[PDB]
Amino acid sequence: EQESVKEFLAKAKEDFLKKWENPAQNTAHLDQFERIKTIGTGSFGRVMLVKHMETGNHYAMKILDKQKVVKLKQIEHTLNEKRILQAVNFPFLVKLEFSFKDNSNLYMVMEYVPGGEMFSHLRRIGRFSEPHARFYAAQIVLTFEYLHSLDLIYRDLKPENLLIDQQGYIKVADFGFAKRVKGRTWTLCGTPEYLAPEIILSKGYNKAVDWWALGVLIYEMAAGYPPFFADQPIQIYEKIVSGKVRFPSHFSSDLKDLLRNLLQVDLTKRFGNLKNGVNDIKNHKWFATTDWIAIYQRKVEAPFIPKFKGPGDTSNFDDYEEEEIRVSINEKCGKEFSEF
């Protein structure tokens, strides 16, 4: 079993490396897409539903203002985002279909994933049952196994970054702080409720912070709220570094035991970071019902299938204030974003 894993991932590395050292580049242009509706927003620009006209397929195109990226000192991060994303391939990683730039903008046309954000479903329903959250957790366990094995750290796991597709399965969108590193890294980043303690204490950290972020996700999915919360960030970091977590009463004993081993402050005793590796999570009593190969294969019945009134339907996403894409007649930031 764990030698299929070894072999699967070895082949995946042959694949991921070819694309890593020679990235796809300028495989489309703006005016080949019909811009329909803003379906989400981040700090860098908007995400829109678009239809590719020659083929009729719908995608989500993420626009990033080059100048806003610079001001935000996210230039190396945004080259990381695209290079990493064009190069990976896994069922639970949102697909980067096309990418290109103009005078004003960076563009990242991805798989349109019509089911909505884990986030807004989690907040609507309140909280997931353990079986339900396990289904999702399993998909994040296998994805991180895939990512970590290619020397990637994801670094921004949250419900906001997980998109449910038609079959109720998951897609890790947003790769804005993912990073290929062997050894330690120091950038202060992620989202406050999910930061590992070593990230807060400016210590220098590794892939184990994704594993801790796995714990927060699962807790948040099963409790309805995160393990450490407050109104300001600085009070969240107090509660994180303090090394105490109260569990809801309805939490099963096995689930509390996974979380105690995931949201472990001490790196030498934290699941994912030990010598057995990712399997101290896969073979854990909480995932005893979980058939990892069937999860990979898409064979299991999702516990929730999003609503789908047809192609180009945006009802599982919010509405947002529309704004024109403007392309300056002069090139901005060409030296900096050259390799995009």
């Binding site: 986030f119 907040r123 921004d156 906001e160 980043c189 992620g190 406050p192 409720e193 409790a223 407050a230």
Partner: peptide, 20 residues
């Protein structure tokens, strides 16, 4: 309850990442 404290907090919407 812990839930009530949370839905009454200011961090129930989409959460931004930090920059440094």
């Amino acid at each position: 309850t812990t839930y009530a404290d949370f839905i009454a907090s200011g961090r129930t919407g989409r959460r931004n990442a930090i920059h440094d």
